[PDB]
Enzyme design. Structure first.
Site, mmCIF file in Angstrom:
data_model
loop_
_atom_site.group_PDB
_atom_site.id
_atom_site.type_symbol
_atom_site.label_atom_id
_atom_site.label_comp_id
_atom_site.label_asym_id
_atom_site.label_seq_id
_atom_site.Cartn_x
_atom_site.Cartn_y
_atom_site.Cartn_z
ATOM 1 N N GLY I 29 -1.598 6.688 4.870
ATOM 2 C CA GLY I 29 -1.089 6.187 3.595
ATOM 3 C C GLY I 29 -2.026 5.230 2.883
ATOM 4 C CB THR I 30 -1.892 3.803 -0.592
ATOM 5 O OG1 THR I 30 -0.803 2.874 -0.658
ATOM 6 C CG2 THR I 30 -1.435 5.162 -1.128
ATOM 7 C CB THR I 31 -5.089 -0.110 1.515
ATOM 8 O OG1 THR I 31 -6.000 0.967 1.774
ATOM 9 C CG2 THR I 31 -5.380 -1.260 2.479
ATOM 10 C CD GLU I 46 -5.838 2.486 -2.024
ATOM 11 O OE1 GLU I 46 -6.803 3.143 -2.461
ATOM 12 O OE2 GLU I 46 -5.772 2.093 -0.839
ATOM 13 C CB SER I 74 0.761 1.700 4.247
ATOM 14 O OG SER I 74 0.276 0.602 3.495
#
Ligand SMILES: [Cl-]
Ligand SMILES: [Mg+2]
Ligand SMILES: [Mg+2]
Ligand SMILES: [Mg+2]
Ligand SMILES: [Mg+2]
Lengths: 241, 231, 204, 195, 244, 222, 196, 250, 243
Positions: I29-31, I46, I74
């Site tokens: 997943g995104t940070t 993010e 995330s």
């Protein structure tokens, strides 16, 4: 072999999930140790904070279950906390229903019975933890009772738990062979803590700073954990010796 | 592979295969487009038939006077989710005398879809939805996927060859976004967008389905002779 | 509208020398109207005797229930239930309906087959055990029975004497009660014979 | 409802049941049969609360007919009467009890004896030479105490019944519109058509 | 989820047999043989215990013959524990009938309900069936003396003489040979033992490896008496027919 | 009923009369109102006789199971807590008024329980219809620091005040003494000050006085 | 019952009479109506003895469990637990309870919970049948930030008057002092307080 | 969530064996030896306290348990399973007997209740069988003294004497030679102690041996006096000292 | 083997492979990060701009619980929402009974026990998120990170998602270079920077920054989003330091 995934017997009469739950007990690579004084029961556990980003104060495997009972856990923290919350609830309920404080050994038996159920009922997994309960029982005096994923429990003169538990165990056996008695013949809990740390040092062959240990003390009518400073004060006394 | 027997099983790379297979039913679905200005939001849906003797399956469902969706994938699953939405819009009016925010409609669908992705015996929804509405903060377009992921957009498309329309809209952005106070122009930009996803066959009178909602327009659906004007 | 005095009836038990006696009238009425002159109120399960006064439907129900329970007792325990034990079973069963009771005044009588002791006990509708060395009374003429028993009774009566005493206690109590009488039955009970006698009494 | 009577003679049970159905100040019907055949040699007459009476009677009948088909065997009058009693004894402690009183007349083919059972709504069962429910008893029990003999013929029982009905027609405050009379014997159940 | 670990105890084979019932019957065929023989004046029940140790308490033991009510008994073949569950049910059912009708339960009706319970475990609930076969010896005033058997399938049938457990094929041929309709109880007693004697997997049939019961009209006029034989009485009847 | 409880040096004593009534009628002249909850916890009960017996037995049973489970001698506060919470749950409808006393590893204890579920603590207590007669005596003669022999005397005096002055109480005095470090001693019919005088006459009848219609031998055998 | 709780300079003091009554009969003349639900959170009980005990036992249990999980509960929290019980079961309870405790942040606090199960935070509180007779006296004599001795006198004089006029009230005057120093129990007998 | 295992985990294999019961008995086989012997005036049950560490206090672990004042139990197999069975067994003696009849159940019936509990773990949904065999010794007024073995299947049998677990085959043979129907209680205790030495390798004293009797009534163990019909429990655990006295004259 | 096919099964090494597989979805997943400061906490995440068609500022990912707790995560987004919904029920129930708003450690265990409960049975799947959360209570500021196993601890700073190692390293810096503490307004800038520095590990698509904070002094102990001038000012500080 699906007899290895749920808690049913294997052809040799074994419960593999229970055995594998014991192996998760050492996942955290911590060793714990409990001894009894005349007036007290002491439990020490290694404290290892690897990440620099962690708030060290929130990293603990010692729990205050009740005013009088303390519990140290050997195993992963989620299962540990699950067990601690349950034991807190059971100890509170016992006091409400029966009008006196739940004794350490009875709580141990209760938590052991709960663990036994997970070994017999399929839908529940065993908790991957070993629970060492300590107190100064009002009838029995200083008390150590320990629970495992098998649902087994017993009272101890002293005990140890973790990867290097056998080292610590024999160290302690040898002391009690020598001393001839059931406990540390010491007046203050301060010196019993000192004993506990000293014999953990010998057995493990390591040195400890104040942030490498975690200490819980049980006296008549309270169980409490020590601060870094209380431990540092204790390490100093050991050094000047 | 071994990890696709049910929704309650992760694969070793951390994927949920039943959810991904549910997503696949959307891709086999007939194309539908949604897009909006600051004043209106439009759904265009290419309807599909079984054969020449059959009706063209309805792809657009009204949820309230100010909200509705188009579907792509399993139709009964859209009927369930739209019905749930109808109830939530209804509950907001009866209890709070409040029109349900399109953003809240999004969250409630996400949370309903998700429960079926974490429990044994259940199955994920096998339908994608495009939700349009005009609420107290203007026009809105939402894209529902049965993984539970809901996304607010200026425009999008889902279903078979949705990639053509989705590129077109990505180009057309700064044009259609400012078709304020003109219904028939925003619709035209939708019918144009959907045409990027056609092949061998093109838009007819019992083929095309348009819905529009906005500032002074109750969510309404146009089919049949009422869409001839746009082919 | 007082369930315990709709039907009427009485039961009395008495201990003597190596024997017990239990007795009851035969009346079943609906208030003023007498209906049956054949309604016995004493039952036995093996060698344990149970008399039950009060609401007749509950009398019948409890007999059927205690037959049920003593039959299963015998099958599992491989022996007949004793009076001391049956008394406990009667009590448990009545208290189980604590807030919707059977409207009865049961009486237990018998001789323990191991110890040879004579045993009697009585209960309130809610299961309280009233144990007595001498006599137990029950029913609509319980006051009268109490007065008859308290003066007529003496300890260690021989079976044939005890018969006269208990019969005279019942007959004269019944005759001062509108809802009791219309016949009587007396059980004389010894270690291993039981005699049942039907008394002649006034039929009004 | 109101009048239901029963007499057990040498070789039969006779049941007599009033024909009137009264609601308010109107006799709605004067030919009501207050009885159900439970089995070919068992008859149940009934009286009590409106609606409850037939609902109970028919429910019992269904159960007994079911038993017959299942076992291809007719339950004895004693067995039926106990079933009935238990049903009423349950009912009395229900949320809404069945307010129905019954007489059960049966011929036991195994014993070759007629049997009459009187059961009230509380579940109070009693076997009798003769029985009645309601205010009927207050006149007929004393009359039967006098004129009844245990070895009477079916014919003698009918005349004895005629005595009872005549007394009830004289002293009862309400017009119950005569009775339907039925005989239960070794040959089953039949209705006396002119009474 | 849990579906992985479910044996599906209540499904048909492609041949239309019930796997678990078949395997329960297979289990039962290794159980101590039990025989029932029905006479015009009574019923015999005889059963062989599973291979005794000299230290087992023989007199206060009961592995094979159980009393249901005063007019009905059963002989058991299979898992003892499973049988006791069903026996207590049957005992209760008998008492409910008595309570309801004020009459002792007809033998068949009791047999049907126990069989119906067994049947249920073969059709719904996903549980293993009861690994038990019964021989019911009983009396009622409708059919007089009756013998029945029921097995894990919940199917039951009536018999003049029948066996369950081990070597029933052997035993059934021998009963068929020597059984006849006008036979009396004491002949039936003799036949039952002589049959076990020939079918047993033991060296010789002794009093300590047997349970024995009779249902006679052997009391006082038009009434029935059950006799579960004491060890000493089996010793005598084994001598009285010259098997020892 | 009259029931009492009195603390002393090294323990506690409870006592009770032995009369049971149904309205004005004496149903039982010698009923036992002292109930054993566990070997060294005893309960004196007033109120509805069945209720005191049932509630005392239930808690006594659960206390035994608890004692076995915990590997410990049971405590009075446990019996107190279990009794009060049961009675409270039933909102007074279980008419049990109890004086709970006993010794345990903690010491000697004396409490009372009201049917609605409230509990008392005291050195001397009395309950039941005769409790005012009893309490009058206790308030007159009680002192701090009683010997065992003084407490027994005080307790049975308090019960006597009830026996003689309360129509709801009579017959005999039962006592039970629970002393620390010793077995509980149950003194059934400790006092019997109401023995019936000799009757003036014997009413044993000449045999054959009673008219009989029928006889028959009853079969109790199989 | 006459009961009260008063905040002062160093903390809070709870006061109560010792009379339990069934009609005009005094079932208990030495009752303790000052009940501990936590080390330094106590309550005064009035109304049905059975109700208020059952409530206090439940609250004690709740705060014991609270402590195990989240540390020392605030006095406000304790009062909320009481309220929840009293409010939600208002149809079946007769309980007038005063909650009083000592924090180190918040010092002495007093909450009163009357019949309906409403909550009222006050500088001091009076309740029970006997309280009616001292509304006048207490309103006139209470000051904020009294010393320990003044507060003990205020309670002693107040309850003395409540006891004097209320037949339902009587016996000893019990008090509980709640400060940073700890927990002190006071008792005052009739011969002292009656002739104030 | 919750128990979705509503089906049996014990089913018949094609040969007709019940797998989990067989495997449960195998766990019982691995279990420490325990035994019981019935005398004319008593019953003895005994077993080895095999301590897990020397730091463990084996007094705190009771392998021999009072069930009623006249009934005791010992086991071989899995300790935790036994512990919970004893809890359930004590309770069922009350709920299904004492609270009904006002007296403790006779041995055979209490045994019957335990058997039932164990049978149900052999058929109920989502559980495995109990991995223990019990020996239950007790007394009751109408049957006298009795000894019962209860197996994982739920089957139970009365015994004159027997053994279960590790060295049971050998120990049962030992008991056949020594047992007669005229044994006094002290004679059976002595035989029990002899039989047990065979199967114990390490230390053999009153601290490593657990042994209880069902014998005479013990008024000194009642806790109260004044009811002459209550005479005290017939169950008595012998002390460490009491056993060592008997091991000298061995 | 086959030990990884069913949740709650221990492998022979004593591991729950399904929980470990859930972690792979988290790592995918995104940070997202969290920074603990002097009198508060900061959260940033993010948001990958899949397309021009995403309305900017209008797919919010940081979630408030009660009025004083922020949650970011995330992994599987809907799983995170489910967890926050539960946290909201847990906080409401705590406030309802005890009046005071739920303390952060208390709130952390509520989520911990709930997440842990989804590793106990085979009839549920573990949570496919790591959750960073915290706020201000009566004892000061608290930051926590919670994983699919139910494991959580208190953090000086925390990070998860694809850029976690980049962010971790950047977090260790601030811990070493500010041993006496970091102010809230500083942490908002640093938060922005680290998300930009962590975006390199995910640089196919460009992204939208999102920040929130609770500070005793700056937000009165309440959770607010950072928008407008303070957001742009921190976006710019970050743009500075990637050059
Ligand atoms: Cl437990
Ligand atoms: Mg399991
Ligand atoms: Mg009369
Ligand atoms: Mg109330
Ligand atoms: Mg006054």
């Amino acid at each position: 072999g699906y007899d290895r995934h749920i808690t049913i017997f294997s052809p040799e009469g074994r419960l593999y999930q229970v055995e594998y739950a014991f192996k998760a007990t050492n996942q955290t690579n911590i060793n714990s140790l409990a001894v009894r004084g005349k007036d007290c029961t002491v439990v020490i556990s290694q404290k290892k904070v690897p990440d620099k980003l962690l708030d060290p104060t929130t990293v603990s495997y010692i729990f205050c279950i009740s005013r009088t009972i303390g519990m140290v856990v050997n195993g992963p923290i989620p299962d540990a906390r699950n067990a601690a919350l349950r034991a807190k609830a059971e100890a509170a309920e016992f006091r409400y229903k029966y009008g006196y404080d739940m004794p350490c050994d009875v709580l141990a038996k209760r938590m052991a019975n709960l663990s036994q159920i997970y070994t017999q009922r399929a839908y529940m997994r065993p908790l991957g933890v070993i629970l060492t309960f300590v107190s100064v029982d009002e009838e029995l005096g200083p008390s150590i009772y320990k629970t495992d994923p098998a649902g087994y429990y017993v009272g101890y003169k002293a005990t140890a738990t973790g990867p290097k538990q056998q080292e610590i165990t024999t160290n302690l056996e040898n002391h009690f062979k020598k001393s001839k008695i059931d406990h540390i013949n010491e007046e203050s809990w301060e010196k019993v803590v000192e004993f506990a740390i000293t014999h953990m040092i010998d057995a493990l062959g390591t040195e400890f700073s104040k942030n490498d240990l975690e200490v819980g003390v049980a006296t008549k009518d309270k169980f409490f954990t020590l601060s870094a400073e209380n431990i540092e004060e204790r390490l100093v006394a050991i050094a000047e010796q | 592979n071994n990890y696709d027997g049910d929704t309650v099983t992760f694969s070793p790379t951390g994927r949920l295969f039943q959810v991904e297979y549910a997503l696949e039913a959307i891709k086999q679905g007939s194309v539908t487009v949604g897009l909006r200005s600051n004043t209106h939001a439009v759904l265009v849906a290419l309807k599909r038939n079984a054969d020449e003797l059959s009706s063209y399956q309805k792809k657009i469902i009204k949820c309230d006077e100010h909200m509705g969706l188009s579907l792509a994938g399993l139709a009964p699953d859209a009927r369930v989710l739209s019905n749930y939405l109808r109830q939530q819009c209804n509950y907001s009016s009866l209890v709070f005398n409040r029109k349900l925010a399109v953003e809240r409609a999004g969250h409630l669908l996400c949370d309903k879809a998700q429960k079926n992705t974490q429990s044994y015996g259940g199955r994920p929804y096998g339908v994608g939805l495009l939700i349009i509405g005009y609420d107290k903060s203007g026009a809105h377009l939402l894209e529902f996927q049965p993984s539970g992921n809901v996304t607010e957009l200026y425009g999008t498309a889902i279903g078979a060859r949705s990639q053509g329309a989705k590129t077109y809209l990505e180009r057309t952005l700064d044009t259609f976004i400012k078709i304020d106070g003109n219904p028939d122009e925003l619709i035209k930009a939708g019918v144009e967008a959907i045409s990027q996803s056609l092949r061998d066959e093109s838009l007819t009178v019992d083929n095309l389905s348009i819905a529009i909602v906005g500032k002074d327009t109750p969510f309404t659906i146009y089919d049949g002779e009422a869409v001839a004007k746009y082919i | 509208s007082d369930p315990s005095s709709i039907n009427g009836g009485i039961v009395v038990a008495m201990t003597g020398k190596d024997c017990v006696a239990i007795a009851c009238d035969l009346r079943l009425g609906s208030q003023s109207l007498g209906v049956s002159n054949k309604f016995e109120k004493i039952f036995h399960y093996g060698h344990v005797f149970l008399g039950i006064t009060g609401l007749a439907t509950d009398v019948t129900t409890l007999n059927e229930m205690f037959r049920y329970k003593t039959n299963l007792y015998k099958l599992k325990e491989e022996r007949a239930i004793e009076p001391e034990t049956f008394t406990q079973l009667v009590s448990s069963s009545l208290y189980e309906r604590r807030f919707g009771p059977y409207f009865v005044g049961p009486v237990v009588a018998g001789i323990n087959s191991k110890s040879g002791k004579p045993f009697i006990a009585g209960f309130d509708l809610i299961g309280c055990i009233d144990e007595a060395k001498d006599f137990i009374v029950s029913g609509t003429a319980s006051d009268q029975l109490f007065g008859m028993c308290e003066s007529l009774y003496e300890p260690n009566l021989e079976p044939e004497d005890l018969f006269e005493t208990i019969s005279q206690a019942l007959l004269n109590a019944a005759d001062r009660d509108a809802l009791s009488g219309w016949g009587a039955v007396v059980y004389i009970i010894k270690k291993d014979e039981v005699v049942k006698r039907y008394l002649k009494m006034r039929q009004d | 409802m109101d009048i239901i009577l029963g007499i057990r003679v040498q070789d039969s049970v006779i049941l007599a049941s009033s024909k009137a159905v009264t609601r308010g100040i109107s006799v709605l019907k004067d030919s009501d049969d207050k009885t159900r055949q439970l089995s070919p040699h068992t008859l149940m007459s009934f009286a009590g609360e409106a609606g409850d009476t037939v609902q109970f009677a028919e429910y019992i009948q269904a159960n007994i007919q079911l038993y017959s088909i299942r076992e291809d065997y007719e339950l004895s009058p004693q067995a039926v009467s106990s079933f009935v009693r238990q049903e009423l004894a349950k009912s009395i402690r229900s949320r809404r009890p069945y307010q129905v009183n019954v007489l059960i007349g049966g011929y036991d083919k195994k014993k070759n004896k007629p049997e009459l059972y009187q059961i009230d709504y509380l579940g109070t069962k009693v076997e009798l030479p003769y029985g009645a429910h309601g205010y009927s008893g207050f006149y007929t029990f004393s009359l039967l105490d006098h004129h009844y003999r245990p070895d009477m013929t079916t014919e003698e029982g009918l005349d004895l019944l005629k005595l009872c009905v005549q007394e009830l027609e004289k002293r009862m405050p309400m017009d119950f519109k005569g009775v339907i009379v039925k005989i239960v014997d070794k040959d089953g159940i039949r209705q006396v058509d002119d009474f | 989820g849990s579906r992985r670990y479910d044996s599906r105890t209540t499904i048909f084979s492609p041949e239309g047999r019930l796997y678990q019932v078949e395997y329960a019957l297979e289990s039962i065929s290794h159980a101590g043989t039990a025989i029932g023989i029905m006479a015009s004046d009574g019923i015999v029940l005889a059963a062989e215990r599973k291979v005794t140790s000299t230290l087992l308490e023989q007199d206060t033991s009961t592995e094979k013959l159980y009393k249901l009510n005063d007019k009905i008994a059963v002989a058991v073949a299979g898992l003892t524990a499973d049988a006791e569950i069903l026996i207590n049910t049957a005992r209760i059912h008998a008492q409910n009938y008595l309570k309801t009708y004020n009459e002792d339960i007809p033998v068949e009706i009791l047999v049907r309900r126990l069989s119906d319970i067994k049947q249920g475990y073969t059709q719904h609930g996903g549980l293993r069936p009861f690994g038990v076969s019964f021989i019911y010896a009983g009396y009622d005033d409708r059919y007089g003396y009756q013998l029945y058997t029921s097995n894990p399938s919940g199917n039951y049938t009536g018999w003049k003489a029948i066996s369950v457990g081990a070597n029933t094929s052997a035993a059934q041929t021998l009963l068929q040979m020597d059984y006849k309709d006008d036979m009396k109880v004491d002949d039936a007693i003799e036949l039952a033992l002589k049959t076990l004697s020939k079918t047993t997997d033991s060296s010789a049939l002794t009093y300590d490896r047997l349970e024995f019961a009779t249902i006679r009209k052997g009391a006082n006029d038009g009434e029935v008496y059950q006799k579960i034989f004491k060890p000493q009485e089996i010793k005598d009847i084994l001598v009285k027919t010259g098997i020892t | 009923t009259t029931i009492v409880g009195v603390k002393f040096n090294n323990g506690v004593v409870i006592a009770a009369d032995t009369r049971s009534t149904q309205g004005p009628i004496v149903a039982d002249k010698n009923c036992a109102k002292l109930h054993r909850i566990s070997p060294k916890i005893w309960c004196a009960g007033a109120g509805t006789a069945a209720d005191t017996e049932a509630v005392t037995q239930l808690i006594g049973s659960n206390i035994e199971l608890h004692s076995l489970y915990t590997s410990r001698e049971p405590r009075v506060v446990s019996a107190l807590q279990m009794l009060k919470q049961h009675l409270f749950k039933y909102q007074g409808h279980i008419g049990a008024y109890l004086i709970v006393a006993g010794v345990d590893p903690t010491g000697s204890h004396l409490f009372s329980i009201h049917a609605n579920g409230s509990t008392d603590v005291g050195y001397y207590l009395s309950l039941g219809s005769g409790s005012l007669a009893a309490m009058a005596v206790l308030e007159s003669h009680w002192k701090q620091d009683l010997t065992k022999e003084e407490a027994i005397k005080l307790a049975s005096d308090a019960i006597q005040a009830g026996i003689w002055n309360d129509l709801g109480s009579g017959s005999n005095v039962d006592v039970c003494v629970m002393e620390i470090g010793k077995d509980a001693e149950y003194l059934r019919n400790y006092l019997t000050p109401n023995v019936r005088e000799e009757k003036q006459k014997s009413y044993k009848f000449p045999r054959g006085t009673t008219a009989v219609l029928k006889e028959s031998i009853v079969n109790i055998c199989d | 019952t006459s009961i009260m709780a008063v905040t002062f300079k160093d903390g809070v003091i709870l006061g109560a009479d010792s009379r339990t009554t069934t009609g005009a009969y005094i079932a208990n003349r030495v009752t303790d109506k000052l009940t501990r639900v936590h080390d330094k959170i106590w309550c005064c009980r009035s109304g049905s003895a059975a109700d208020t005990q059952a409530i206090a036992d439940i609250v004690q249990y709740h705060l014991e469990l609270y402590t195990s999980q989240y540390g020392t509960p605030s006095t406000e929290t304790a009062a909320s637990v009481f309220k929840e019980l009293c409010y939600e079961n208002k149809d079946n309870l007769t309980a007038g309870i005063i909650v009083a405790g000592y924090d180190d942040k918040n010092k002495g606090e007093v909450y009163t919970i009357p019949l309906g199960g409403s909550v009222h935070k006050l500088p001091y509180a009076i309740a029970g049948s006997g309280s009616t007779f001292i509304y006048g006296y207490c309103d006139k004599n209470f000051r904020e930030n009294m010393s320990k001795e003044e507060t003990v006198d205020f309670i002693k004089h107040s309850l003395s008057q409540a006891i004097k006029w209320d037949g339902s009230s009587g016996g000893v005057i019990r008090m509980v002092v709640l400060t940073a120093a700890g927990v002190e129990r006071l008792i005052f007998y009739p011969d002292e307080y009656e002739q104030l | 969530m919750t128990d979705r295992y509503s089906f049996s985990l014990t089913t018949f294999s094609p040969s007709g064996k019940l797998g989990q019961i067989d495997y449960a008995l195998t766990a019982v086989k691995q279990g420490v030896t325990s035994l019981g012997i019935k005398a004319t005036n008593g019953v003895v049950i005994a077993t080895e306290k095999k301590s897990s560490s020397p730091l463990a206090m084996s007094e705190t672990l009771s392998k021999v348990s009072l069930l009623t004042p006249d009934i005791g139990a010992v086991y071989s197999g899995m300790g935790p399973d036994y512990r919970v069975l004893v809890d359930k067994s004590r309770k069922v003696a009350h709920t299904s007997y004492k609270r009904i009849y006002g007296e403790y159940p006779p041995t055979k019936l209490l045994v019957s209740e335990v058997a039932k509990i164990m049978q149900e773990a052999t058929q109920s949904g989502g559980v495995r069988p109990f991995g223990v065999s019990l020996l239950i010794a007790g007394h009751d007024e109408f049957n006298g003294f009795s000894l019962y073995q209860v197996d994982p299947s739920g089957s139970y049998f009365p015994w004159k004497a027997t053994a279960i677990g590790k060295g049971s085959v050998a120990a049962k043979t030992f008991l056949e030679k020594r047992w007669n129907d005229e044994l006094e209680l002290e004679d059976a205790i002595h035989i029990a102690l002899l039989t047990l030495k065979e199967s114990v390798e390490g230390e053999f004293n009153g601290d490593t041996i657990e042994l209880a009797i069902i014998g005479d009534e013990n008024p000194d163990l009642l806790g109260y006096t004044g009811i002459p019909t209550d005479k005290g429990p017939r169950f008595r655990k012998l002390t460490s000292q009491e056993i060592n006295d008997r091991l000298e004259a061995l | 083997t086959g030990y990884d096919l069913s949740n709650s099964v221990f492998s022979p090494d004593g591991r729950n492979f399904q929980v470990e597989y859930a972690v792979k979805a988290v790592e995918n997943g995104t940070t997202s990060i969290g920074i603990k400061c002097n009198d508060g906490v900061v959260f940033a995440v993010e948001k990958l701009i899949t397309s021009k068609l995403l309305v900017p500022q209008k797919n919010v990912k940081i979630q408030v619980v009660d009025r004083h707790i922020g949650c970011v995560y995330s992994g599987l987004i809907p799983d995170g929402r489910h967890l926050v919904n539960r946290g909201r029920e847990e906080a409401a129930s705590f406030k309802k009974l005890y009046k005071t708003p739920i303390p952060i450690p208390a709130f952390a265990d509520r989520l911990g026990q709930y997440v842990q409960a989804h590793t106990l049975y085979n009839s549920v799947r573990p949570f496919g998120v790591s959750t960073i959360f915290g706020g201000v209570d009566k004892n000061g500021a608290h930051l926590y990170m919670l994983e699919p196993s139910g494991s959580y601890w208190g953090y000086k700073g925390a990070a998860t998602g694809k850029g976690r190692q980049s962010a971790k390293a950047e977090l260790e810096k601030l811990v070493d270079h500010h041993p006496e503490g970091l102010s809230a307004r500083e942490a908002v800038k640093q938060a922005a920077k680290i998300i930009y520095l962590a975006h390199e590990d995910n640089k196919e698509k460009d992204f939208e920054l999102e920040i929130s904070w609770c500070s005793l002094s700056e937000t009165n102990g309440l959770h607010k989003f950072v928008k407008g001038d303070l957001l742009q000012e921190a976006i710019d500080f970050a743009q500075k330091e990637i050059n």
